[PDB]
Amino acid sequence: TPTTFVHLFEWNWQDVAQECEQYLGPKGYAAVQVSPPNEHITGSQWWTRYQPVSYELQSRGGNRAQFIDMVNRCSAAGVDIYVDTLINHMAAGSGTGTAGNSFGNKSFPIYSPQDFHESCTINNSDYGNDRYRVQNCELVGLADLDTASNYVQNTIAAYINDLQAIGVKGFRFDASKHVAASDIQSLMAKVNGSPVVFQEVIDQGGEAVGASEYLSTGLVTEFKYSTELGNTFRNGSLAWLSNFGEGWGFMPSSSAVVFVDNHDNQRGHGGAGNVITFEDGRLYDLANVFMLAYPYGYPKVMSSYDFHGDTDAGGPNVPVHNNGNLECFASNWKCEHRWSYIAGGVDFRNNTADNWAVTNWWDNTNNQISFGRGSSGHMAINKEDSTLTATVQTDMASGQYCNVLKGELSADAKSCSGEVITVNSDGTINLNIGAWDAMAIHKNAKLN
Ligand SMILES: C=C1O[C@H](O[C@H]2[C@H](O)[C@@H](O)[C@H](O)O[C@@H]2CO)[C@H](O)[C@@H](O)[C@@H]1N[C@H]1C=C(C=O)C(=O)[C@H](O)[C@H]1O
Numbered sequence: 343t344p345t346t347f348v349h350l351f352e353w354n355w356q357d358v359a360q361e362c363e364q365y366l367g368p369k370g371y372a373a374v375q376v377s378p379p380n381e382h383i384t385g386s387q388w389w390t391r392y393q394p395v396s397y398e399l400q401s402r403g404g405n406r407a408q409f410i411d412m413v414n415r416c417s418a419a420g421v422d423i424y425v426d427t428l429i430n431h432m433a434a435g436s437g438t439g440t441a442g443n444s445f446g447n448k449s450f451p452i453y454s455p456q457d458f459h460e461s462c463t464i465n466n467s468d469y470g471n472d473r474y475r476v477q478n479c480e481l482v483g484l485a486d487l488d489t490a491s492n493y494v495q496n497t498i499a500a501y502i503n504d505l506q507a508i509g510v511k512g513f514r515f516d517a518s519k520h521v522a523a524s525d526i527q528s529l530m531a532k533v534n535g536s537p538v539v540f541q542e543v544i545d546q547g548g549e550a551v552g553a554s555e556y557l558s559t560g561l562v563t564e565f566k567y568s569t570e571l572g573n574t575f576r577n578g579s580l581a582w583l584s585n586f587g588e589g590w591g592f593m594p595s596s597s598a599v600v601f602v603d604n605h606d607n608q609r610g611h612g613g614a615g616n617v618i619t620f621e622d623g624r625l626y627d628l629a630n631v632f633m634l635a636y637p638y639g640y641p642k643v644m645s646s647y648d649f650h651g652d653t654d655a656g657g658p659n660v661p662v663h664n665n666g667n668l669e670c671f672a673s674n675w676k677c678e679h680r681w682s683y684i685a686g687g688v689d690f691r692n693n694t695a696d697n698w699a700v701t702n703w704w705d706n707t708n709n710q711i712s713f714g715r716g717s718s719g720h721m722a723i724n725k726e727d728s729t730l731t732a733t734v735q736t737d738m739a740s741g742q743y744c745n746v747l748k749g750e751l752s753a754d755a756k757s758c759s760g761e762v763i764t765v766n767s768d769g770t771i772n773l774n775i776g777a778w779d780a781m782a783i784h785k786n787a788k789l790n
């Protein structure tokens with residue numbers, strides 16, 4: 343069953359539609375978070391998508407027909423679409439949009455200067471001691487919408503409802519911390535049905551505005567997860583993760599959206615160098631394996647492009663699906679959602695969704711850990727530099743299983759493509775995991 347979504351960052355609508363059919367659907371990913379599909383400022387940088395001009399569906403990702411085509415094709419494949427929705431602001435300065443519209447002096451095709459809060463700047467110090475400025479002033483000069491206005495609320499809700507009519511199933515509410523929770527409650531009252539909604543709120547503690555304020559309007563991004571996971575995997579002991587989640591002070595599991603990294607923090611925005619990303623290779627594989635095996639939050643796998651150290655640069659100048667050639671894994675699109683350890687982690691999460699408990703936790707007091715999900719699955723990670731050969735207890739049926747991180751079960755269930763793990767008659771496994779490696783097995787990848 344579906345348990346994990348993916349952020350196809352800067353992927354165009356044609357690439358996403360093909361990816362849904364060829365990979366995401368077959369592999370069991372629940373949904374795709376796409377880049378803002380509305381009209382935005384021209385320019386090659388990735389951040390131009392976060393400066394709206396209007397709500398017309400003509401963006402760098404493609405036009406309206408291509409967007410609709412993507413929603414239909416993904417839906418037929420069993421994959422939902424979550425739209426990155428800008429509820430806090432409009433573009434800064436003046437210029438021209440991707441659909442031909444002009445704007446300037448807080449004057450847009452759909453908003454007048456009177457539909458915005460009076461200009462003021464959000465200073466870094468405001469985050470810790472002035473909620474009024476955090477929510478009414480401008481985020482790096484972006485025109486701050488008067489979200490308490492009935493006209494503004496109606497206009498954003500009409501956009502959200504139009505997207506739902508096309509078939510969009512969820513929404514990421516961008517920059518939610520900058521909008522009073524009460525304004526979001528009023529906005530939601532105008533939204534049809536009950537789509538999936540997750541709100542971006544960066545809260546590591548000590549903020550004037552807390553993540554907990556948004557729990558009643560939808561899921562909330564738990565940024566402590568990304569940071570603490572990265573910090574533990576790099577500078578701490580994996581043994582500490584035995585009570586990861588609410589035990590560490592995170593929000594309720596059922597309210598959280600978690601990730602190893604997102605488009606902002608992999609670039610140093612809202613996250614330090616301890617955040618683990620595709621650049622870290624095997625370290626990234628292991629961090630993802632932990633997140634996907636661990637029963638906390640609703641995870642989203644990151645799918646990036648090699649930005650070659652340029653934190654402002656837009657994506658590759660070549661599509662992912664390029665004339666029958668997949669532009670993945672090298673210096674263009676990274677396609678982490680296709681990395682064997684990550685796709686295997688997703689398969690494990692999908693197949694252990696009937697048991698959300700962490701059972702039989704074992705560790706060597708440091709960087710070797712192992713735990714199960716009852717009789718649905720078991721996993722182990724070795725981050726020491728000597729082989730993990732400990733015998734661990736599981737609740738799994740004895741037999742042969744495919745290590746799903748390195749391969750998969752054949753259609754006739756007679757063989758695996760990767761190494762085989764053996765669960766003894768007493769339920770134990772005699773591990774044999776090399777340094778910086780791991781294993782995961784589940785009840786639906788058992789050899790016959
Ligand atoms: C890029 C982000 O900037 C702000 O985040 C700040 C955190 O709120 C603050 O706690 C932390 O200390 O510092 C962060 C800045 O470095 C916004 O709050 C946050 O919303 C924003 N991220 C999203 C907003 C955009 C504007 O539309 C986009 O450019 C980003 O890519 C969004 O993910």
Ligand SMILES: [Ca+2]
Pocket residue numbers: 430476477478479486487520521
């Ligand atoms: Ca605001």
Ligand SMILES: [Cl-]
Pocket residue numbers: 542563604
């Ligand atoms: Cl996010």
